[PDB]
Amino acid sequence: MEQTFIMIKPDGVQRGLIGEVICRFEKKGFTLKGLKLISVERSFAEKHYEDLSSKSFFSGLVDYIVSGPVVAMIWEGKNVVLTGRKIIGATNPAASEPGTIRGDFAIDIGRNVIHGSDSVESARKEIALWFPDGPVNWQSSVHPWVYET
Amino acid sequence: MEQTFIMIKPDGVQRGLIGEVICRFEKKGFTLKGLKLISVERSFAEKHYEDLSSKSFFSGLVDYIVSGPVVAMIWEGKNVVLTGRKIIGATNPAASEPGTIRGDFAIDIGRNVIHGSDSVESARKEIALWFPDGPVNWQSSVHPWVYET
Amino acid sequence: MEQTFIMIKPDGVQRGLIGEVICRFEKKGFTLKGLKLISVERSFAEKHYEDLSSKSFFSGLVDYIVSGPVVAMIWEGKNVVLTGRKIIGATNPAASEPGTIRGDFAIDIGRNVIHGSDSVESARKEIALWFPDGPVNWQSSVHPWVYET
Amino acid sequence: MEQTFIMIKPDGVQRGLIGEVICRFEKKGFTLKGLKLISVERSFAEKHYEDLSSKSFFSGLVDYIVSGPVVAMIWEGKNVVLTGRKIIGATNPAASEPGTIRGDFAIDIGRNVIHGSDSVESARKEIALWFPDGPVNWQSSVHPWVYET
Amino acid sequence: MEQTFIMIKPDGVQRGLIGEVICRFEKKGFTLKGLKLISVERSFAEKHYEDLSSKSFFSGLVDYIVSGPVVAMIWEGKNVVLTGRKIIGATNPAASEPGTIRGDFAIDIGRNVIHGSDSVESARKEIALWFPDGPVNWQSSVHPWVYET
Amino acid sequence: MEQTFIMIKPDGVQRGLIGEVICRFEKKGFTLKGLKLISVERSFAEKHYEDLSSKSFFSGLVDYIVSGPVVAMIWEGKNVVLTGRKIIGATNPAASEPGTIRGDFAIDIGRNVIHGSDSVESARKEIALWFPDGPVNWQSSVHPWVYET
């Protein structure tokens, strides 16, 4: 029942990796509770990167996340946050293993295709910011076959 | 260019086919201009199937489309409507060709997995209804290689 | 909710196409009720092709079908018999369309990878011959999403 | 050459992973020597989890493998046992790396999709119990390209 | 056995469709006998399109295949010419059926990803033009399972 | 930018993995600047394996490199040398991880399917030997999304 935030960055969308990303999370057995294609404003990007406002690269991170539309999502499942980080792969694309998203598609650390919350409380902040209206709640009929009880 | 409305139906989401559907349209060269996971409310449904409100099965469609979340989408490109219909395949899953979304995943007419605007006219109507705020604009960097001139 | 008989011919096994074949029926929404790797013997083969005892090439069919192990299957679902033939493609690989099993892998009539019941009649009969013990029953948790009512 | 027993648990069948699982072993270069869909008997089950007779969770493992039909298999090759478990992934889905069967599909340790022999000795026992009548033998024509000499 | 000439156009290379193409012919069972990545010269281009020199769109063809590298190939197998054509799909993307290369990735008639000889005769000319040094010969170890005797 | 030499060995070609391989490097974002099907001559082969002269299996490797055609390539991008190797996987298939080329298809050390430059140094050497005419230059239109600046 845990939830994490997953976002396909501008390059992920430009490189036509949207469907592929979602397939990984779907096959794994997680539940999509949020999804949308959106372009970010300056104010939002900065707030999303708030915890870095005082960094050399801050201005860059904003310019980029706004240089194109992105796909925001909410994924729910046991250990979805850590599992999600595992599926995505190492932050530095050169260290990510084949089989992970960044491992199979990313090369440059600045065009690392996607983002995933780093922690549970981190996913909470991220989800509230990106999904003010809340989650889309539904139950999967395959659920008794993905979990015990 | 032209735009069409594609909607992954409740059974499409439950069967974890979201990613796959998107993949095909992405591979064809179309650009996504709208995307959202939605929980349809009775009244909204009735407007969507409004052109059929006179059929003896109207309420049936309403009961179903509201039985679970769906994924709304806007796809753009030349002939996007016709191709969209072609990619989806025939209405009757019994006549739908392998290679099409319905031919590969659907069996029952009442669980056809996906919806596609049947005409350009019904398209503009559908995307206006489902996406009030209009489309998310962007330019595929591979445009010069998908379209001539 | 009829059943049909699909058999991956010796060549299908040699070429490592067992998983692929099984995947297409699984994704279509069909239920496997019978599965087994077996190497057929002379007499049983003559009874399978029994309907062609009066053909010159009859001797060869039996010869071939026995040259290596095959995979016998029982698949269940609406129109599974007719849909199965669609999924398999034309008898002559030269006519089988891309997207169908023979369309994607088969080249020679003699090496056509698979066999499928050509009719509900042939079906209920082949199924009894190959699977004398009957089928293995179970129901898909996503059944209400693949079928109506 | 070496042999291992791989079994697709009831949750693996329900989730439509049969083809997927087989594809991976076929592509690796391994030979399939046994395959069948079985609905396990309680007494058969208790013998399968025999060495766990003492553990508290014994009845749980037994009630479960009986709850749905499974797919039993025999695969042959060099280090097929160790590669088999490597291909499968960490016992606890929380650790299983993307690229492995459990890594891409499993979430709950109780619904870990598949089983593989932990050793050569236990495989001998496993194949002898699940495939009393021995394996279906054949020689791959690509063998001389998978193995040297 | 019969041979044909397939060429991935500049847009195909740009859109990263090289491997996908080869996969389709490999999985069909055909044998690759020639493979080169080339940046075609103006004069060579005019030669390849000689049979069309007085045609109104001649300059377009020339300007086009010269705008970016291409992948030239030789494929061998029974009915490889007509089949290669069936794999590529309708010349007009708008008509190409899902499952074919153009059906899956093309949209604009002038950016249709691939070229395939349309006759055994034309194939010999094109093969003699693109690979004057002849094909790279070799037998496949799965040949006996692709063809009869 | 940096470039490396990848070679799909005879077994790799015989098992029909050419497309598959090219796909992994393509999806990663790397640029193919050289590609070809070649039946290597004894003398050339002997140069390629220079450093292993003093060794014993030397002659063995040579005999093998000439026993069947191969596919030579040049791939360009940041860290393409070590990444190419990370994609290929451990030399010993028993150690190669699922997700990597050898991890997914190799079994025997002698049929490791592929070869990749071990360093930028050897890479420069290998590239010169196999591609004396230089590379084929072009700029992916996706470049700005694969690299920041």
Coordinates of N, CA, C and O in Angstrom, one line a residue, chain B residues 7 9-10 40-42 44-46 48-68 70 109-112 115, chain C residues 148:
Chain B
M7 N -8.4 6.0 -25.8 CA -8.6 5.8 -24.4 C -8.5 4.3 -24.1 O -9.1 3.4 -24.7
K9 N -9.4 1.4 -22.0 CA -10.6 1.1 -21.2 C -10.2 0.3 -19.9 O -9.1 -0.2 -19.7
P10 N -11.2 0.3 -18.9 CA -11.0 -0.4 -17.6 C -10.4 -1.8 -17.6 O -9.6 -2.1 -16.8
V40 N -13.8 7.8 -14.1 CA -14.9 8.4 -14.7 C -16.2 8.4 -13.8 O -16.5 7.4 -13.2
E41 N -16.8 9.5 -13.7 CA -18.1 9.7 -12.9 C -19.3 9.6 -13.9 O -19.3 10.1 -15.0
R42 N -20.3 8.8 -13.4 CA -21.5 8.6 -14.1 C -22.0 9.6 -15.2 O -22.2 9.2 -16.3
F44 N -20.3 12.2 -16.5 CA -19.3 12.4 -17.6 C -19.4 11.4 -18.6 O -19.3 11.6 -19.8
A45 N -19.6 10.1 -18.2 CA -19.7 9.0 -19.1 C -20.8 9.2 -20.0 O -20.7 9.0 -21.2
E46 N -22.0 9.6 -19.5 CA -23.2 9.8 -20.3 C -23.0 10.9 -21.4 O -23.6 10.8 -22.4
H48 N -19.9 11.4 -22.8 CA -19.0 10.7 -23.7 C -19.8 9.8 -24.7 O -19.5 9.9 -25.9
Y49 N -20.7 9.0 -24.2 CA -21.4 8.1 -25.0 C -22.8 8.7 -25.4 O -23.7 8.0 -25.8
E50 N -22.8 10.0 -25.2 CA -24.0 10.8 -25.6 C -24.6 10.6 -27.0 O -25.8 10.6 -27.2
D51 N -23.7 10.3 -27.9 CA -24.1 10.1 -29.3 C -24.8 8.7 -29.4 O -25.4 8.4 -30.5
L52 N -24.8 7.9 -28.3 CA -25.5 6.6 -28.3 C -26.6 6.6 -27.3 O -27.2 5.5 -27.1
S53 N -26.8 7.7 -26.6 CA -27.8 7.7 -25.5 C -29.2 7.1 -25.8 O -30.0 6.9 -24.9
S54 N -29.4 6.9 -27.1 CA -30.7 6.3 -27.5 C -30.7 4.8 -27.6 O -31.8 4.2 -27.8
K55 N -29.6 4.2 -27.5 CA -29.5 2.7 -27.6 C -29.9 2.0 -26.4 O -29.9 2.5 -25.3
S56 N -30.4 0.7 -26.5 CA -30.9 -0.1 -25.4 C -29.7 -0.5 -24.5 O -30.0 -1.1 -23.5
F57 N -28.5 -0.3 -25.0 CA -27.3 -0.7 -24.2 C -26.5 0.5 -23.7 O -25.5 0.4 -23.1
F58 N -27.1 1.7 -23.8 CA -26.4 2.9 -23.4 C -26.0 2.9 -21.9 O -24.8 3.0 -21.6
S59 N -26.9 2.7 -21.0 CA -26.6 2.6 -19.6 C -25.5 1.5 -19.3 O -24.7 1.6 -18.4
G60 N -25.5 0.5 -20.2 CA -24.5 -0.6 -20.1 C -23.1 0.0 -20.2 O -22.3 -0.3 -19.4
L61 N -22.9 0.8 -21.3 CA -21.6 1.4 -21.5 C -21.2 2.3 -20.3 O -20.1 2.4 -19.9
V62 N -22.2 3.0 -19.8 CA -22.0 3.9 -18.7 C -21.6 3.1 -17.5 O -20.6 3.4 -16.8
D63 N -22.3 2.0 -17.2 CA -22.0 1.1 -16.1 C -20.5 0.6 -16.1 O -19.9 0.4 -15.1
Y64 N -20.1 0.3 -17.3 CA -18.8 -0.3 -17.5 C -17.6 0.7 -17.4 O -16.7 0.6 -16.6
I65 N -17.7 1.7 -18.3 CA -16.6 2.8 -18.3 C -16.4 3.4 -16.9 O -15.3 4.0 -16.7
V66 N -17.4 3.2 -16.0 CA -17.3 3.8 -14.7 C -16.9 2.7 -13.7 O -16.6 3.0 -12.5
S67 N -16.8 1.5 -14.1 CA -16.4 0.3 -13.2 C -14.9 0.3 -12.9 O -14.5 -0.4 -12.0
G68 N -14.2 1.2 -13.5 CA -12.7 1.2 -13.2 C -12.0 2.4 -13.9 O -12.6 3.1 -14.7
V70 N -9.6 4.6 -16.3 CA -9.3 4.5 -17.8 C -8.1 5.5 -18.0 O -7.8 6.3 -17.1
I109 N -16.2 -8.7 -27.3 CA -16.6 -7.4 -27.8 C -16.8 -6.4 -26.7 O -16.5 -5.2 -26.8
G110 N -17.3 -6.9 -25.6 CA -17.6 -6.0 -24.4 C -16.4 -5.7 -23.6 O -16.5 -5.1 -22.5
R111 N -15.2 -6.2 -24.0 CA -14.0 -6.0 -23.3 C -12.9 -5.9 -24.4 O -11.9 -6.6 -24.4
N112 N -13.2 -4.9 -25.2 CA -12.3 -4.5 -26.4 C -11.0 -3.8 -26.0 O -10.3 -3.4 -26.9
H115 N -10.2 2.3 -26.9 CA -11.1 3.1 -27.7 C -10.4 4.1 -28.5 O -9.3 4.6 -28.2
Chain C
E148 N -17.5 -10.7 -20.4 CA -18.6 -10.0 -19.8 C -19.6 -10.9 -18.9 O -19.6 -12.1 -19.0

